[PDB]
Write a protein that binds this ligand. Structure first.
Ligand SMILES: CO[C@@]1(NC(=O)Cc2cccs2)C(=O)N2C(C(=O)O)=C(COC(N)=O)CS[C@@H]21
Length: 159
């Protein structure tokens, strides 16, 4: 694996919007979005967020993430974490989370990264745990069917 990163570009949008494979996956990474996902929905998030970044390997965009909260000197909140379905479990999210930690430290002077993860996303919860994130709170949210879900609010000090 020889991963690189760069800011997200218009030409990446169709690729990245292809990453969520079902309503659950879209919910876990972008709960405000409505299935089916679209480039317009992805662009809307990019426009209102900061730091949208892609991970690339062998000419393929394999990952995407951004910040939906940012407070200089304080923290950033990382979301829209998406990984190409053929590249799952190969370290792309771990790589990109590390890049986003460096961005938060360097650009925003953040002392903390927040990551919130829905309860059903076991793989996410375990990944963020392996990367040193700890659970701080659990918040109630509602899914598209009106069912109650638990949002696990985690954080990690940045060094
Ligand atoms: C403002 O916080 C968020 N939204 C809400 O909590 C509001 C709602 C949630 C469910 C119904 S309404 C927001 O935006 N979030 C994102 C995101 O879109 O990136 C994620 C995805 O996180 C990752 N890890 O990719 C977790 S919920 C959190």
């Amino acid at each position: 694996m020889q991963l690189s990163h760069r800011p997200a570009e218009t030409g990446d949008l169709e690729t990245v919007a292809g990453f969520p494979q079902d309503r659950d996956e879209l919910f876990y990474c972008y709960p405000k979005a409505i299935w089916p996902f679209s480039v317009a929905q992805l662009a809307a998030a990019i426009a209102e967020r900061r730091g949208s970044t892609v991970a690339v390997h062998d000419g393929q965009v394999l990952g995407f993430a951004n910040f939906y909260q940012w407070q200089h000197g304080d923290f950033c909140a990382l979301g829209n974490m998406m990984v190409a379905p053929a590249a799952r479990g190969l370290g792309v999210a771990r790589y990109l989370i590390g890049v986003m930690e460096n961005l938060a430290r360097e650009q925003y002077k953040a002392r903390l990264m927040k990551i919130s993860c829905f309860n059903a996303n076991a793989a996410g919860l375990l990944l963020y745990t392996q990367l040193g994130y700890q659970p701080r709170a659990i918040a109630e949210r509602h899914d598209p069917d009106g069912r109650r879900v638990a949002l696990i609010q985690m954080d990690k000090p940045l060094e």
